[PDB]
């Protein structure tokens, strides 16, 4: 029996491995809305499966569609790669756009058919062996995911071309197994038959308003009037099973959160392990690492042990329990979410304005501000931002001991942090900061200030600041952690001056401002001032919140596809798979429905998003589980004719 299986398993592992490659690249290629864009196309890929089962069981069977959809899948990836080269080498965008739609079909028509195809090989009441396959099969899906991430860092033609090539390798091997596959063909228009049967029955029910209206079957009492009984039996099994899925999709909206929402939180939690220098975006991989080792344990020890004590868990029992751990997983995040709040600074909102003042002169200056004054010595700054109201910024006076007063006639934008630089009694400057949140992806911004009469130019690892006016600062640019070297160039600088310099360790999430000042020998000097503190909380603390979800998703997901396959009738095995996959499609809509948040504190969203909904669904789902939909032995009922 294993012979024909290996061709199938290696195909999915090889296939889905390449599939993940396109994911990270796509968002980078085009560059809150990232949540929509990331989720929108994720759901889109799961609408196509609708086109999968219909064609598969109503036309050419299952073997043909896999081969056909495999070819069209590769073309989409290949076309997108070359079309991208056409735009840069030489309307053009239209070529790239078409690839996306073509790529989706393969991603859609393959997932349902492949799963149903594997199960067919098991026929001799091989409950344990067929289940072993599904446990093995799911372990293969994440195997590709793990390898995809590690190779991604190590070009566009190869970035797109190379992943596409593997699918061809996967495609070729699957063909070789044709002589060994156990395959079945359709015997008519199954989809059409059901369509007509449903319409006639309900139409008949509409008739006889008060004549034998009480139905002994909610729908079948009327369908039987024209159609074959065993035909009614098959639809009856599928109709009941599909009902149980109504409460399921909410859960998938609770698992996807790790893709973006948690990764966003990883930005503010970058306390780096001493041993290594893990990056923020790599945390998602931790789900892959656990799942490969966790899956064998459950099948190996846990399930046999549970049997010994006589708990006798059923598929329904596990699925209901599986949702519990996922729910409890999120509340752990909320604990971590509130914890970080003790360290992150506060940013202005709307009509609020935050002000920072930095003195770079050689003499102390006195600053007059609405309802308060600040005196800052040479090369000194305020240790924290000062918040103010836009309307309350009425009078601003600047003076130095023994110097005339100087007013400020500039303007400030509400909702933007502003910095005031003063170097002489009547010489000041107003500059915008640009950033009003934690830096994206964890990198730390850097800028510079000009004090010399002439323009200056500075370069630092592929990024250049040039033509900077005197007593005016540039805008921030972001660099990774560690230590970076930089060089300066300016006409006023004599050649003999040394422009080579090095920085201190950067860590993650910090924001420092440099200052350039003249030495007695005309050589420049470098001073550093902080604006935002470095991230403190360690990143490994996300492991707790991760383990429960992955441990809970192994018990849930594995049973989901297996239980969907068993209850399906021998004729419409693939159709139900669409229902199962269709569950995920709805899920991403709910998170998309979030749109704006009622308030700002993220801790609220992390909590109500699961507790008020997921648990309520669980109890509601349990009620439906009380109606023993598992009591259907789909394998034997057909034997009754």
Residue numbers in the entry: 12 to 42, 50 to 108, 120 to 183, 197 to 683
Provide the authors' original text about this structure.
PepT1 belongs to the solute carrier family 15 (SLC15), also known as the proton-coupled oligopeptide transporter (POT) family, which consists of four members in eukaryotes: PepT1 (SLC15A1), PepT2 (SLC15A2), PhT1 (SLC15A4), and PhT2 (SLC15A3). PepT1 and PepT2 are best characterized and mediate the uptake, distribution, and resorption of di- and tripeptides in the body. PepT1 and PepT2 are secondary active transporters, which are energized by the inward-directed electrochemical proton gradient. Both polypeptides consist of a core transporter unit of predicted 12 transmembrane helices (TMs) of the major facilitator superfamily (MFS) fold and an extracellular immunoglobulin-like domain (ECD) placed between TM9 and TM10.
HsPepT1 was captured in the outward-facing conformation, both in apo and substrate-bound states, and in a substrate-bound outward-facing occluded structure. In this transition, salt bridges present on the intracellular side of all previous outward-facing states are disrupted, and a new one is established on the extracellular side, leading to the complete sealing from the luminal solvent. (C) Further bending of TM2 allows the interaction of H57, S302, N630, and D298 as a crucial step before (D) total sealing of the extracellular side and switching to the inward-facing occluded state stabilized by the salt bridge R185-D323.
